[PDB]
Amino acid sequence: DNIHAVSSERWRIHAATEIEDINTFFGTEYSSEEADTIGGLVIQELGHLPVRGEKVLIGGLQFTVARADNRRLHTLMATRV
C-alpha cells in the first residue's frame, strides 16, 4: 500500500503516491497541474527538496518528511491539522 495507516490518525505515505489517490483517500482537492505525486507536490510547495523531519502544511494535512536523500524524497508521514 502506498498509503499505510500507522494509527487511525497517522499515515505513512510513499512519495510516489499519485495526487489523485491522496485526494480520494483524504477528501482533498490538491492540484496535479505541477506534479504527479505527493512527493512532487511537497517539493513544489516548499520550493526545495526537503530533509528528514521537515514538515509542510498543505490544505488540512501536515506532511512530515520521514525518509529523503540528496536525490529524492521517498516517504512522508501525514496527519490532520
Cell of 51: 530533509
* Residue pair 54/65 in contact by the 8 Å Cβ criterion: yes
Taking the least distance from each CB to a copy of itself, the nearer of 56 and 79 is 79
- Most distant pair of Cα atoms in the chain: their distance: 31
Q: Which is nearer to Zn ion, 28 or 80 (CB)?
A: 28
Distance CA 76, CA 61 (A): 11
Q: Which residues bind to a copy of itself, rule: CB under 8 A?
A: 1-5, 7-8, 11-12, 14-18, 20-21, 24-27, 31, 36-37, 67, 74-75, 80
Indicate the annotated binding residues: 1, 4, 14, 18, 20, 29, 33, 36, 48, 54, 69, 74
